[PDB]
Amino acid sequence: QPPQDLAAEQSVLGGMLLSKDAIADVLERLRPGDFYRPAHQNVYDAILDLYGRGEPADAVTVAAELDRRGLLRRIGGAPYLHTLISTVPTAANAGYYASIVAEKALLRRLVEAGTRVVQYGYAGAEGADVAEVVDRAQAEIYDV
Amino acid sequence: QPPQDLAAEQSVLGGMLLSKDAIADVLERLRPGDFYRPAHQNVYDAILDLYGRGEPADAVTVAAELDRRGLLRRIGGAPYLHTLISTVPTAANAGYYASIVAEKALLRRLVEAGTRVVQYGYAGAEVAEVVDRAQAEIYD
Amino acid sequence: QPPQDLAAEQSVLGGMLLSKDAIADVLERLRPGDFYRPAHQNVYDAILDLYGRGEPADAVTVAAELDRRGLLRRIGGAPYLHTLISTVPTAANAGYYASIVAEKALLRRLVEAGTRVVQYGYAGAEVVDRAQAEIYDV
Amino acid sequence: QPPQDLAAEQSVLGGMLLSKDAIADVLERLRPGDFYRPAHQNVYDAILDLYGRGEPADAVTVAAELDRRGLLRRIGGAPYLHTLISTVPTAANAGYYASIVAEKALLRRLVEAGTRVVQYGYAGAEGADVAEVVDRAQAEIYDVA
Amino acid sequence: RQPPQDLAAEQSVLGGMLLSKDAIADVLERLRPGDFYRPAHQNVYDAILDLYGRGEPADAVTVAAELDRRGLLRRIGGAPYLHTLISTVPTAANAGYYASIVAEKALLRRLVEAGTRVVQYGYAGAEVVDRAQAEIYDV
Amino acid sequence: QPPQDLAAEQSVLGGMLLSKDAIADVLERLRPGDFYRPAHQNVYDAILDLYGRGEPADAVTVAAELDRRGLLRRIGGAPYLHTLISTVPTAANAGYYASIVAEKALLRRLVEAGTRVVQYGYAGAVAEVVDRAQAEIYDVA
């Protein structure tokens, strides 16, 4: 089970749906890819799409952005967004929760890179010489 | 499967046991740690200890050096040393065989390093020291 | 199945009930016909009636206006009006919610248009024309 | 079942196989894709292939054009072409029957375009704005109109 | 697999030739007796050409007589089959078009026969390669 | 069974594994694809690979090269290379065996070209079809 904090992911998304100011704080710390759960990445991307267009991102506008993308039934609909809101009182701590999500994502990519390096050792790189295999494995750990 | 090449290892050793020139060509690209078979690392270490003394390293003298270390029986005795000499295609080519051993060793080091990094990632999950150590491991 | 966003409809209505400025924003984007739910169409008409006569349109006064048209029970009464007011995230965003309702209404008119061109096909230039009209009319 | 007239399709093809004047008449009215039955479209396309080349289109030359296309066995061989010819006395009425086939094709394309529009309505804005959804819908009917 | 051929086109060519002297001129430009798949058809074709070459009319009656005197009338299905040929041709003036179908099918059949010989030259074991080339380049 | 000579393929490869000089004799007579068995084509390609960068090509290096390529388990491992060597006393006849392999590869390409021609004749649809069949035999010739 890869490094993750699903509770922190829920709090981040809930905070973002409650406050525009929390979105700016989260953008500071997170990338799309940092969310372990694909549904959470979908929600995050929908929030950012609306925010980047200067449109409000709340339970209603976000559900509609998801639906336009055909993604609403995959997250579990508008009732999931309401569940996300309820994991946090207010959006005050959103940056803090985003820092947990980012730290767990670093660790998870470290684990993924490490397993990829192992895969390089056992299998090489499509017939490449060991020198190339070693350069590729070193870049894997660099890209964390 | 652990990256290794049995015949290349046997052939490096056989070439060395037959030719002092072969030892010079192998020393440049190998450490005893490069051998996957513990018997081979033992035999290699015995050859180099004698070579560092001016003592000719052939099957007989190597057997005596390994016996002295209490390692002769462990490595398969005189009969295994004989297998090594019969195996090498060409003693003059020991350098090429060595490069094969060296490459397999590198690949094995990746498996060990990668495995360590995975462990650090799980340890961190229980971060800056973790990431840095993981990078020490791979760049080494 | 029919394209619709019931939460967006509720939030348009809730915003208008909580804010006079919201009504002005929604007016530029919607027709009563855009609402899927008949109950929402009636609530909307009631707000616009109050508004057009310069009268305050809140939960209480709108209920009074619906009662007079004989529709308060039909739309779900004061409990339902309370639901609308609870549902809207932010009343000042009522225009954004209206855009959503309008977009769904357009998609729904597309389904409706396509369905009737199909019906025209199985019936019978007499039909080609009427069907042509239906989909540029969307 | 989609708007169609199989009897009128047979009569059109029979007429065309009997007379070059009938092919010309039919061409005034029909477009590629107008035949409901795939075997009938294949026969029609083979006749038009020959006619566009200034070659005659009779049972022999058409069976060979179909055979070159690997479609002769698909439709039941030259005996099928002889059956089509037997559906008509002369090729006098070929344009009349083509007008039936064309009307049914118009109506079928309307049914097909309609259901395509419905599909777009339900699967809306997948990639757009909704304007490009509406435009795809209108492009469907332009094709028909 | 069926060797490439079109038996209806073969019948129509011969039918048209029996019905029109101009058709024989048209067909002569496009065919040889060997283009016909059925031996019976080659025999009829040869008879027509022999008559034609002598300035003699070639019709159901005169062709049967030519064939009979060759000892081939019975072999080709008699005077009744000559009637089958004449009733088959959709339009005699289109003989040239039916001949192109027969010519094209004979070309395809020669490819099949040539490819088959080449395969056999492979299994028979510089001489073979030359023979195999000659087979394909003379199709 | 397609024109082939498995024994001569083994003997060619064994000769090449025994003598650098025989690699030159063989490549004088063989082209890519001449081996009937894919494993043999792999072995051959590995030998020329090592040859081209002036490395010795013996049972140890060739095996390592094939392993790099993911092809060693496919030939049966390093012991097969030892079986190939054991198939000939010395590499003296390597050119002779390569000439047999070349010949059979010619006759096999002739068989394949021929069956493709048969397929062109059945496929139909004319002047371009004839030219295709001829390009087929041009390749062999």
Domain formed by E1-139, architecture: Orthogonal Bundle (1.10)
Domain C1-138 fold is: DNAb Helicase; Chain A (1.10.860)
What C118-121 contacts at long range (C-beta under 8 Å, 24+ apart), as own/partner pairs, is C118/D110, C118/D111, C118/D114, C118/D115, C118/D118, C119/D114, C120/D110, C120/D114, C121/D3, C121/D107, C121/D108, C121/D110, C121/D111, C121/D114
* Separation between Cα atoms, residue A101 and residue A95, nearest integer Å: 10
The CATH number of D1-145, from 1.10.10.10, 1.10.860.10, 1.10.10.60, 3.10.20.740, is: 1.10.860.10
Contact D111, C122 (CB under 8 A): yes
Which amino acid type is present at position A120? Y
Report yes or no on chains B and E touching (3+ CB pairs under 8 A).
no
Contact B3, B108 (CB under 8 A): yes
Selection from D142, D106, D110, D137 nearest residue D31 by Cα = D106
Between the alpha carbon of residue C51 and those of residues C18, C70, C73, the distances in Å are 13, 19, 22
Transcribe F11-48 into DSSP letters. Answer: HHHHHHHH-HHHHHHHHTT--TT--SSHHHHHHHHHHH
Superfamily of domain A1-144: DNAb Helicase; Chain A (1.10.860.10)
**Between chains, do C115 and D118 touch, taking CB under 8 Å as contact?**
yes
Selection from B123, A93, F128 nearest residue D68 by Cα = F128
- Counting as contact any 3 or more CB pairs under 8 A, the partners of E are D, F
Question: At what angle are helices E60-70 and E39-53 packed, to 10 degrees?
Answer: 110
Would you call F100 an interface residue with chain E, using a CB distance cutoff of 8 Å?
A: no
Would you call B106 an interface residue with chain F, using a CB distance cutoff of 8 Å?
A: no
- Which residue of chain D comes nearest to C4, CA vs CA? D122
Would you call E25 an interface residue with chain D, using a CB distance cutoff of 8 Å?
A: no
Q: Which residue has the tokens 């529709």?
A: C71
What D134-143 contacts at long range (C-beta under 8 Å, 24+ apart), as own/partner pairs, is D134/C106, D134/C110, D134/C138, D137/C110, D137/C113, D137/C114, D137/C135, D137/C138, D138/C135, D138/C136, D140/C135, D140/D113, D140/D116, D141/C117, D141/C131, D141/C132, D141/C135, D141/C136, D141/D113, D141/D117, D143/D109, D143/D113
| CATH no. for F1-141 | 1.10.860.10
Which residues 6+ apart lie within 8 Å of D11 measured at CB? D87, D88, D93, D94, D97
- Which residue of chain F comes nearest to E115, CA vs CA? F114
* Separation between Cα atoms, residue C107 and residue D118, nearest integer Å: 9
Contact D113, D139 (CB under 8 A): no
Selection from C68, C76, C73, C83 nearest residue C17 by Cα = C83
Q: What is the 8-class DSSP label of residue B118?
A: H
Sign of the dihedral through C-alpha D22, D23, D27, D31 = positive
SS3 at position C56 = coil
Would you call C90 an interface residue with chain A, using a CB distance cutoff of 8 Å?
A: yes
* Separation between Cα atoms, residue E24 and residue E63, nearest integer Å: 13
Interface test with C, best of A16, A60, A66 (most C CBs within 10 A): A60
Please give the structure tokens belonging to residue B5.
């090449």
Would you call C80 an interface residue with chain A, using a CB distance cutoff of 8 Å?
A: no
- Can you state the percent helix, strand and coil of chain D, rounding each to 5? 70, 0, 30
- Which residue of chain F comes nearest to B10, CA vs CA? F60
Q: Which residue has the tokens 């996957």?
A: B36
CA distance A135 to chain B (A): 10
Contact F43, F74 (CB under 8 A): no
Selection from A58, A51, A111 nearest residue A85 by Cα = A58
- F139 to chain E: which residues are within 8 Å by CB? none
- A70 to chain D: which residues are within 8 Å by CB? 123, 126
* Separation between Cα atoms, residue D12 and residue D62, nearest integer Å: 15
* Separation between Cα atoms, residue C114 and residue C133, nearest integer Å: 11
Q: How many other CB atoms are found less than 10 A from the CB of residue C131?
A: 23
**Between chains, do D120 and C136 touch, taking CB under 8 Å as contact?**
no
Would you call A3 an interface residue with chain B, using a CB distance cutoff of 8 Å?
A: yes
What's the CA dihedral at B93, B95, B98, B103 to 10 degrees? -110
Give the resolution value in Å: 1.9
Would you call B123 an interface residue with chain A, using a CB distance cutoff of 8 Å?
A: no
* Separation between Cα atoms, residue A143 and residue F31, nearest integer Å: 44
Q: What is the 8-class DSSP label of residue E2?
A: P
* Separation between Cα atoms, residue F57 and residue F48, nearest integer Å: 8
Q: Which residue has the tokens 């099957």?
A: B59
* Separation between Cα atoms, residue E107 and residue A72, nearest integer Å: 63
- B118 to chain A: which residues are within 8 Å by CB? 111, 114-115, 118
Which amino acid type is present at position C30? L
Chain breaks of chain E after residues with C–N above 2.5 Å: 125
> Looking at chain F, how many residues does it have?
141
* Separation between Cα atoms, residue E78 and residue D98, nearest integer Å: 44
* Separation between Cα atoms, residue D100 and residue D5, nearest integer Å: 7
Contact E81, E40 (CB under 8 A): yes
Which residues 6+ apart lie within 8 Å of A79 measured at CB? none
The CATH number of B1-140, from 3.30.2350.10, 2.60.40.10, 1.10.860.10, 3.30.300.30, is: 1.10.860.10
